[PDB]
Amino acid sequence: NFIHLIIALPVAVLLIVGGLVIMLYVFHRKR
């Protein structure tokens, strides 16, 4: 479906951005 791509397009970037924030948070909190 094309709709999936239209939504996946932007979501593809958001997933990376958010993940980076959660990852850094954990590392920073670690010890």
Curated annotation (Swiss-Prot):
Stretches that traverse the bilayer: 5-28
Domain of life: Eukaryota
Coiled-coil ranges from the UniProt annotation: none
UniProt protein name: Insulin-like growth factor 1 receptor beta chain
Organism: Homo sapiens
Residues of the full protein shown: 932 to 962 of 1367
